């Protein structure tokens, strides 16, 4: 996104981006899918 000067290709930066991606794919997304399956299977709003 900032390939002009912010290549971001640093060992620490990528080591951190990997863990954040892991959290996102194993965390927030599952939470949202569960909330959707929940609200979609109960209640009338």
């Amino acid at each position: 996104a900032y390939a002009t000067v912010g290549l971001m290709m640093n060992a620490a930066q990528n080591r951190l981006r990997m863990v954040c991606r892991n959290i996102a794919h194993n965390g927030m997304v599952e939470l949202m899918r569960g909330i959707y399956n929940l609200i979609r299977e109960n209640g009338e709003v």
């Binding site: 990528n14 080591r15 981006r17 990997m18 991606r21 892991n22 794919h25």
Partner: protein, 140 residues
């Protein structure tokens, strides 16, 4: 019309084949994979002596992470996984459909992110890793 003698012969052959395959694979892969996993956390180098204070150097873990981050930034970086492409217009109407189907099946149905992360992190230390797909036919 499968005979029981045929099944017994098959059981014997399969048992001996599994025995040979285990006897090979053990010393071929697992004898190294165990110690590799032990080095992953730095638990293999033992404290030979108390006064030594053998501070371990976690180096394998470091390279493993340095490779895994780039791996995930390559494949799992995009919101989608893959996208089929055809060579003619007579079969382009099916490309998008197959793409949507596989993406849904992989991400919106299965934890493809976790599957890929596991297949990667475990492969660089076990010399290999495997993924599998079957037809689930559950019923109440």
């Amino acid at each position: 019309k499968y005979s029981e003698e045929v099944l017994d012969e098959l059981r014997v052959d399969l048992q001996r084949r599994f025995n040979y395959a285990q006897g090979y694979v053990d010393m071929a892969v697992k004898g190294y994979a165990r110690e590799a996993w032990e080095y992953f956390y730095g638990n293999l180098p033992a404290p030979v002596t108390a006064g030594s204070s053998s501070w371990v150097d976690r180096t394998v873990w470091e390279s493993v992470n340095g490779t895994l981050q780039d791996i995930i930034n390559v494949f799992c970086s995009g919101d989608e996984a893959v996208t089929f492409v055809a060579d003619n217009q007579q079969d382009s109407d099916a490309a998008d459909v197959a793409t949507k189907l596989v993406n849904q099946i992989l991400l919106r149905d299965n934890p493809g992110y976790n599957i890929i992360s596991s297949a990667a992190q475990e492969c660089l230390v076990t010399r290999n890793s495997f993924i599998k797909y079957y037809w689930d036919e559950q019923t109440s």
